[PDB]
C-alpha cells in the first residue's frame, strides 16, 4: 500500500537487482522509466526485492517480468554491490530514494525475449544523455573501482 511504501522509502534503503543484459550484437538492454525517481531517463532493467523473498526467487521473477525470459541467479554473473541515491521518490519531491543494488551481468539472444525498450552499444549508451548516470556507471571503469564484489 502507498502510505506504507512512502514511509519505507523515506526511512530505509530499498534492495534491488539490476541487469546488465548483452545481446549477440554487443549491445545492452535499456528501458524507459515512466515514473519517479529519474523520470523519463533510460535505465538497465531491474527491480526491488520484496519482503521475505529470496535473492534466487527475486532474480527469477524479475528476469521474467523485465526481460520476458525467466533465468536463474546462476545464469547471472555477479556484478558487485552498487548504491543509487535520488533526490526524489515515486510519489514526488518531498523525500529522497536510496537503493542498495545487486548488479548481474549476462548474455542473451535478443530474439528470445518477451518485451519502451532499446538496445545500445557500450559507446552509444555512454554518449547518450537520455540514459541515466546510474546506468552509464556500470560501463565506466572509474565507477567499478571500490565496488564490493568487483
Amino acid at each position: 500500500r502507498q502510505e506504507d511504501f512512502a514511509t519505507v522509502v523515506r526511512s530505509t534503503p530499498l534492495v534491488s537487482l539490476d541487469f546488465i543484459v548483452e545481446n549477440s550484437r554487443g549491445e545492452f538492454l535499456l528501458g524507459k522509466r515512466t515514473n519517479r525517481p529519474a523520470q523519463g531517463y533510460w535505465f538497465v532493467p531491474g527491480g526491488r526485492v520484496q519482503k521475505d523473498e529470496t535473492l534466487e526467487a527475486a532474480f527469477e521473477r524479475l528476469t521474467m517480468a523485465e526481460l520476458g525470459l525467466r533465468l536463474p541467479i546462476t545464469a547471472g554473473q555477479f556484478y558487485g554491490v552498487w548504491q543509487h541515491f535520488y533526490d526524489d521518490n515515486f510519489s514526488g519531491t518531498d523525500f529522497t530514494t536510496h537503493y542498495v543494488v545487486l548488479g548481474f551481468r549476462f548474455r542473451v539472444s535478443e530474439e528470445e525475449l518477451l518485451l519502451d525498450y532499446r538496445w545500445l552499444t557500450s559507446d552509444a549508451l555512454l554518449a547518450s544523455d537520455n540514459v541515466h548516470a546510474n546506468s552509464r556507471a556500470y560501463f565506466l571503469a572509474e565507477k567499478r573501482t571500490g565496488v564490493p564484489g568487483l
Copy 2:
C-alpha cells in the same frame, strides 16, 4: 531518525540492509556477541548492523566497525565476503511479523587486545555450538558458500 511505528512499518514491508563482520584474531578465532533483544534473542552472532537511509556503504562500515568493535576501520580493510540473506520469524518488537535482512559480509583480521557479552571462538567451536545462530554458522560452512553472490 525513525519513530517506533515507522520502523515497524519498515520491518513489516521491506528487507533491511546490513553489514556483517567476520572478525578473526591472532589465534584464528572469530568474534561472536550474544543478542539480548529480539530478533533471535539469546543466540550468538558475528558483529554487525543495518545500513541506514542515505548512508553510503563506506560510511556504514566505518560507523559500524567503531560502534561494534571500538575500532574505526575503512571499508578497504575488509574483504568482501558475499551477499547473504537472513530471515527471522520475529522482530525487534515481538512476534507479530517477520524480519528480513539482505546482508553484506566482510572478513578481516584484528589484534584482539586493540578492540574496545562476547566470545572468541574457532570455527570448529562455533559450528558445534547450539547457541551460535545458523545465520552466523553459515559463514563457516562449505555447503553454504555455494551460490552466494560475490563469493
